[PDB]
Amino acid sequence: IRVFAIPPSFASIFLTKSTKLTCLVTDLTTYDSVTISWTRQNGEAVKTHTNISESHPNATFSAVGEASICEDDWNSGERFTCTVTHTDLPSPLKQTISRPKGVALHRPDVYLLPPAREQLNLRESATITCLVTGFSPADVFVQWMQRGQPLSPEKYVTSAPMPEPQAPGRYFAHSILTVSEEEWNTGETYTCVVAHEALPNRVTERTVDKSTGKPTLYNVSLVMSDTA
């Protein structure tokens, strides 16, 4: 019989560029005549609310609302409230959601490991790993771009942040892209681009090419002789 709040994650702030925070309704009867609003600190009105959900088997209703706000109004620190007044809840309840406290912000360090040499023998598919270590807080965003055009989201897989053992509560998380083995022996570049909320310009990018693991020099020495 509650109402929860879902803010747009930094991976959606960086992607949508149209920040939109929602409030979801859990375990309320599937009835009409519901109150929906988004009031900030001074309590002034916001953009209209649309996209009302449908009926559910467990007799619940989720009156959600999508609104357009500035990305920097959240930076200003607007305590946001979603007020809900339903028939089964005669006493209105207040919600709470905002941009939270200032964490110790550290910087992401993206290293980009190419596929192993012994993996490049069975000629099936190479795997390039973009390792983003030592950031804080969580909610890092990673995507790939070969040449200049963001790969389709079902070729690469990104893991979740996990605490680093030799460090304080700074995470580490890295994801990989499974390229074809006949494409990583062409030249074909693969840049990896990462966005974190503690970076100078909020985006870092790295790039590994085929001509990056080659040895700097050879030092062969033939000593052909005839003794034993």
Binding site: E118, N121, L122, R123, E124, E181
Partner: protein, 107 residues
């Protein structure tokens, strides 16, 4: 090192299956199309679920431990399937090929 080059004909509707030897010890058995320009070998069929991007969904693997023939079949032929298809084993692909043979379009 067997070289049984056969002249099995192919077409769009047509299906050609190659025959290969198997060690039967559940190693990595693969069929690989050698590229003349690249000078290396590119696996078209492997023990794992890998299939070449050009050959996605049009190839089938068929293993008989009973008769000691390892055979692969191609559902449709686009007439571009003319090259050195070599079979083999081991993790390696290039330097592990057992037998090679070049298939053919039309006839």
């Amino acid at each position: 090192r067997i070289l049984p080059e056969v002249k099995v004909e192919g077409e769009l509707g047509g299906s050609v299956t190659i025959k290969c030897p198997l060690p039967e010890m559940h190693v990595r058995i693969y069929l690989c199309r050698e590229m003349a320009g690249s000078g290396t070998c590119g696996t078209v069929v492997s023990t794992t679920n890998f299939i070449k991007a050009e050959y996605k969904g049009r190839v089938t693997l068929k293993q008989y431990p009973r008769k000691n023939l390892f055979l692969v079949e191609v559902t449709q032929l686009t007439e571009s399937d003319s090259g050195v298809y070599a079979c083999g084993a081991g993790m390696n692909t290039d330097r592990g090929k057992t037998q090679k043979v070049t298939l053919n379009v039309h006839s």
